[PDB]
Structure 1
Amino acid sequence: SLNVGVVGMGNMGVPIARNLGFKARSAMYLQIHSRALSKAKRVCDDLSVDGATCAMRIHDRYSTMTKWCDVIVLALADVKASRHALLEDNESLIMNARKGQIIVDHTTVDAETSRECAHEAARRGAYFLDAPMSGSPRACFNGQLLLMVGGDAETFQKMLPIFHMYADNVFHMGESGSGTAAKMISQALVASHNAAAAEALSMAHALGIEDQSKLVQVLDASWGSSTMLRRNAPLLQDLIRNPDKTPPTSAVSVDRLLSDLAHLDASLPKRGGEDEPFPVFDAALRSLAAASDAGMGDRDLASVVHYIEAGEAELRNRT
């Protein structure tokens, strides 16, 4: 058997440890680490009161977690916290890694971070997998998450029954650094399809089509179909026909998308030779940035439709 240890408790860190306590019927030993010992004791008490089938341990430092667990899984809040916990700390998980350990990072970090984490784990002898999470916290509670694991192939085959305890769709992107890029490409496509749907419904209102409930039925059966087109169109109808109406706040925000989009331009090569080798990506990014600073950053992703013309403001005047 293998001992498993989950590091970090936030809004997304708790249900992974809850599912690892539920589905592991005292076969794989569970250890819990957090940024504070009070939060780890709190989540251990929460796992204890609702029915715990496996014994779980609480630790305040990473050294006991390293010397006790074979598999370490991390679910932190930001990139810099995972960089501090994995590499920058004195009792680091990768710098003091045991040969044969398997360290999986579920945070959306840059490509160079996953590259240097894989390099330090390969020099220490361990195996580092980067598998950024995509999904809802309640979908994580129900056990539905999207994971794009990059790392070794046989190490990925060793981690499939552990990954199937809290995620349905777990795919192998290839070598390390390819898993953290898939979330960047996915959210870039999300932003581009949202901008395209906003522009298409703006042109639909410009052409004078009054029935949008039948327009989405044909637009879903065409070649220009997308899931974001199915998602945003009932809200975009009210945001177009009532432009004075403020958009409602959502769980996913403009800043939540731009936080992952802020990792992509640092992980991409230098664009200054041609100044724009990505037209619709920056065309969506400027509209999201114009929607952020105007006071609509925390609201829904359908707020791009009021700032479509504002995406042209950084193109006419900067050139």
Structure 2
Amino acid sequence: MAKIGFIGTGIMGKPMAQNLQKAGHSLFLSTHHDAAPADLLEAGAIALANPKEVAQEAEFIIVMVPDTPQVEDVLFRKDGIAEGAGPNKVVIDMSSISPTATKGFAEKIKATGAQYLDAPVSGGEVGAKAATLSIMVGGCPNTFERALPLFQAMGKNITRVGGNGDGQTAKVANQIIVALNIQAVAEALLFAARNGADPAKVREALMGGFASSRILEVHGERMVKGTFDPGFRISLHQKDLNLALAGARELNLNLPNTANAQQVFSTCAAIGGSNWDHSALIKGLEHMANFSIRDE
């Protein structure tokens, strides 16, 4: 049982802190920008002026913020995790940000004597509260062992991908497969329905062969049923595809399907679908075909 700080107690963070206290850890919070939550402060938490103090007191310091700029700010701001990080302390970045930026952040955090782990989460609020998130970690094996039990308190599909920057690279690779697999099922079902066939029967038939995937089971069904209520919003997927495309431009990769998927997501947003589930990519292609795979 260790002292744990958590910068970013929001939709996926507050829940994550909860399943950590639950495990028997003392959580420390920061009030430099936002106010300390109710179900955390009461269930055992200590409010602090800045993330530095939080880092100064806690052993493991976890960060969960929206994008790359927010990770850099909470880390190296005056009175930030860095100023309070020192030997035998471990910064765990659980946000999904630039892998290249991550490697530079890990290097600056090590200059204080502290260690760094990039542990982006693949799961969503269905894993955040239910403590069943997927976690991909980048860092040294010694440090990963220390934070290994902490991850178990918030998720189950935990993996060490490699050195610092490899956890963020793994999350981005997953996001490329997820977005492209959604587009693969979307294009195939639009073709099927344009040719007069029933997308649901094609899905059934295809789910038995090499077309089988978790995306065909879950998102394929949603595309046929028209259940596009948000679980993973298009905007969040636009942000993740932008990380992959910035990385590809920085490292000279020609990834044409990832590039196209981003433009299809833009059509979805142009028709009011920024807050639809990523499965709603079909409605962009449908708009692009002036034809729906659904009687609507």
Count of paired positions? 289
Give the letter aligned to residue 19 of structure 2. Answer: N
Mapped contact 2:228–2:280 kept (Cα < 8 A) = no
Q: Deviations over 1:21-57 (max 9, x none)?
A: 1121xxx4321225546x3153434xx2xxx4xx532
Alpha-carbon spacing, 1:249–1:289, altered in 2? closer, same or farther (3 Å): same
TM-score by length of 2: 0.88
1:158 and 2:155 are equivalent in the alignment: no
- The answer for the alignment partner of 1:297 in structure 2 is 274
Deviations 1:66-114 (A, max 9, x none): 2211111112233322211102x11221244211210001111112321
Equivalent of residue 56 in structure 2, options 67, 70, 81: 67
Task: Kindly provide the amino acid, as one letter, of the partner of residue 260 in structure 2.
Answer: A
Structure 2: gaps (5+ residues): 290-296
Contact 1:145 1:169 in 2 (8 A): yes
Please give the alpha-carbon distance, in whole angstroms, between the structure 1 residues aligned to 2:113 and 2:7. 21
SS in 2 for 1:296: coil
| RMSD of Structure 2 on Structure 1 (CA) | 2.4
1:1-319 to structure 2, matched below 5 A, reads 2-24=2-24, 28-36=25-33, 39-40=35-36, 42-45=38-41, 48=42, 52=43, 55-87=44-76, 89-210=77-198, 212-238=199-225, 248-270=228-250, 277-308=254-285
Question: TM-score by structure 1 length?
Answer: 0.82
Q: Could you tell me whether the CA contact under 8 Å between 1:95 and 1:120 is conserved in 2?
A: no
Pair 125,188 (structure 1): closer, same or farther in 2 beyond 3 Å: same
Report Cα offsets for 1:238-287 as digits up to 9, x if no partner: 56xxxxxxx74423221121011122222234488xxx821222222221
Q: Percent of aligned pairs with the same residue?
A: 22
8 Å contact kept, 1:143–1:167 = yes
After TM superposition, where is structure 1 displaced by more than 6 Å over at least 4 residues in a row? 309-312
The CA deviation at 1:297 is 1.9
Change (3 A) 1:41 1:185: closer
- Measured in 1, the distance between the counterparts of 2:281 and 2:121 equals 25
The aligned counterpart of 2:292 is none
Instruction: Give distance in 2, aligned partners of 1:44 and 1:152.
Output: 31
Q: Is the 8 A contact 2:180 2:257 kept in 1?
A: yes
Change in Cα spacing, 1:79 to 1:118, as seen in structure 2 (3 Å) is same
Secondary structure of 1:299 counterpart = coil
Higher-Rg structure is 1
- 1:198/1:35 Cα in 2 relative to 1: closer, same or farther (>3 Å)? farther
State the secondary structure of the residue aligned to 2:46: strand
